[PDB]
């Protein structure tokens, strides 16, 4: 796709739940737990 030269690239770890970003992939992982615990059922859906 949009192929070139350019590497040491890192991304911007964005959560797509609440709005957060982090430097590393772990960082984000971890905080997304914040979203996932006991399957605590809500206003999800219904
Ligand atoms: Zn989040």
Redesign the pocket.
């Known amino acids: 796709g949009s192929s070139g030269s350019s590497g040491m690239g890192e991304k911007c770890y964005k959560?797509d739940?609440?709005g957060?970003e982090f430097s590393q992939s772990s960082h984000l992982q971890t905080?997304?737990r914040?979203?996932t615990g006991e399957k605590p059922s809500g206003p999800s859906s219904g």
Do not use: L, N, R
């Open positions: 959560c739940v609440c957060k905080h997304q914040v979203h």
